[PDB]
Paper text:
Here we address this question from biophysical, structural, and immunological perspectives using structurally related lysozyme proteins. To understand the conformational basis for selection or counterselection of cross-reactivity against foreign and self-antigens during antibody hypermutation in germinal centers, we used a mouse model where the cross-reacting foreign and self-antigens are well-defined lysozyme proteins. To investigate the impact of conformational flexibility of foreign antigen on antibodies that cross-react with self, we analyzed mice to track and sequence HyHEL10 (Hy10)-derived antibodies on single B cells responding to four structurally similar lysozyme proteins. The results show germinal centers have remarkable ability to select antibody producing cells along novel hypermutation trajectories, transmuting an antibody with no capacity to differentiate foreign from self into highly foreign-specific antibody derivatives, exploiting conformational flexibility in antigen and antibody.
The greatest discrimination between self and foreign was achieved by antibodies combining four mutations (Hy104X)—L4F, Y33H, S56N, and Y58F—yielding 1/KD = 5.4 × 105 M−1 against self and 1.04 × 109 M−1 affinity against foreign, representing a 1,900-fold difference. Given the unique L4F, Y33H, S56N, and Y58F mutation trajectories induced by FlexR101D, we next used crystallography to understand the structural basis for how these four mutations combined to convert an antibody with nearly identical affinity for self and foreign into one with 1,900-fold self-foreign discrimination. We solved the structure of the quadruply mutated Hy10 (Hy104X) alone and in complex with FlexR101D in a Fab format. Comparison of the Fab components of the Hy104X-FlexR101D and Hy10-RigidR101D complexes to the Fab-only structure of Hy104X show that, in the absence of antigen, Hy104X CDRH1 broadly resembles the conformation observed in the rigid complex (with the exception of minor CDR adjustments to accommodate the L4F mutation and altered W34 conformation). Taken together, the Hy104X mutations enable the antibody to adopt different conformations, retaining essentially the WT structure of the founder antibody in the absence of antigen, while allowing for structural adjustments and picomolar affinity binding in the presence of the antigen. In the results here, the quadruple mutant antibody became dramatically more specific for foreign over self, through 19-fold loss of self-affinity and 67-fold gain of foreign affinity.
Residue numbers in the entry:
A (entry chain H): 2 to 214
B (entry chain L): 1 to 197, 204 to 213
Amino acid sequence: VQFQESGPSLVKPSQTLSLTCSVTGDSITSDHWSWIRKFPGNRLEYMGYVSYSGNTFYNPSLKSRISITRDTSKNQYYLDLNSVTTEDTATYYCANWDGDYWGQGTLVTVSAAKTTPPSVYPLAPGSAAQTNSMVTLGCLVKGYFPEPVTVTWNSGSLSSGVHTFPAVLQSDLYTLSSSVTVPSSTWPSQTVTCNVAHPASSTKVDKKIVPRD
Amino acid sequence: DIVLTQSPATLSVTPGNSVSLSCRASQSIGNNLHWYQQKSHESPRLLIKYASQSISGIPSRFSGSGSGTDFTLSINSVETEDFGMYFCQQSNSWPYTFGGGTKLEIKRADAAPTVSIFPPSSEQLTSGGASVVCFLNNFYPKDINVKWKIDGSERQNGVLNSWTDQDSKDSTYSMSSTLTLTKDEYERHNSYTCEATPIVKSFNRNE
Ligand SMILES: [Cl-]
Ligand SMILES: [Cl-]
Ligand SMILES: [Cl-]
Ligand SMILES: [Cl-]
Ligand SMILES: [Cl-]
Ligand SMILES: [Cl-]
Ligand SMILES: [Cl-]
C-alpha cells in the first residue's frame, strides 16, 4: 500500500491549503482515510478521517476550517484547510485509519515570504589537506526558502558514506551541507556530483566537485 | 480530549538489553492503544494495535500490554535498528490523540570523529559570503565539543552545528560545524582551525 501526497509546499496566510492523497494497493471504499500533521516541535495531531461511505470526523482544534472529501472513482482524497496561519506550518501525512500505511510527509510552510532557490557550492578538499585511504567531499546549500531541499550524489547512484545535515535558519533563509566519503583512488578519476532539488522554486542544480586551483 | 503521557522522555539502551516504555491516558481508553516507531527521517511504522496485538511482519521482540489507563511497550533484546521516536496513540475517543513520544538512543563504545575542513568555495567568495565548513563524521557519544580558531584565537560568533540521527548499523552520529563570515572578515585572517574534544584540522587561506 502506497500514498502519493500532492499540493503546494508554500501557502500565503489567510489562503486555503489543499492537499491530495492518491492511494494504491487498497480501495478508498473500504477502511478509513486520515490526515495527520507533525509540528516542527515533534507533536503529532490527528486532523480528521473519511470513512468508506463518505462520513467525516474532524479534530475540534481546527474549528470548522477543515474539509475532507474523497473521489472513489480516482482512489483519491483531499484536505482543504481554510484561513491558514503560520500555526498551520507542519509536515502533513495521509494514512489509513490505524496508521498501518502512512505516506511520506509533505512539509507545508505558511508564509508571506517569496520562494528563494538555493545557491549550491561544491566543497573539494583544501589544496594541502592530509591524504588518506578515503576522501570526504561536500556540498553547501545556502539561502533557500522554504524548506525542504533534497540532496543526492551522482543522482542517487552514490548512497553509501553520505551524511546530509538538518537545515538551520539564518536571517529568514535555510542552509545545510551534505558530505560524501569515497575511496581516495577513485576521485577525481570517477566524478562526484551533488544534485540539489528545491520543489518550491521548481529548481534542480547539479555541481560537480572539482579539485581546487 | 484524552491526554497521553509517555515516560521516560529519553532512554539509552545497549543492544541485547530490554526496555519498557510507559503510556498513561487521562481517562480509560479500554484496549484502543496503538504504538508507533518513527525515525526523524521517514514515516511512523505501526508496531502494536489494541494495546497488545502484534502487526503482521513486526519482529517478535516488540510486545505491548495494558487496558484502561496504563500501557507499556516492551522491546526485549533491543537491536541497533531500534533507535528513534516511539509514540502511543488512543483511538477510543474522538479526537484521536498521540503521546509526546519517547526518544530511544542506542548505546555503543566511544568513537573519535573523522574531521574534514573545507575553505570557502571560489564561487561563494564572489557573492561576498565565506562559509568555512567542518564535518565530524562517525563519532559517539552525541555531545561532542567543537572549537573554532582564527589565527590562534578562540571563535564562537557565527558558528552553527547540525547533527544527523543515529546510524542504524553502527549507532554513530555525524555533525557539521559551519563558521559563516563575510568575504571581508575571511580575507583579513590567514589560519582557520576546527577541533573536536583534541582532533584538529587547519588550513591557511594563503597556501
Ligand atoms: Cl489501486
Ligand atoms: Cl499568520
Ligand atoms: Cl531542508
Ligand atoms: Cl549526477
Ligand atoms: Cl542498557
Ligand atoms: Cl564576519
Ligand atoms: Cl587557527
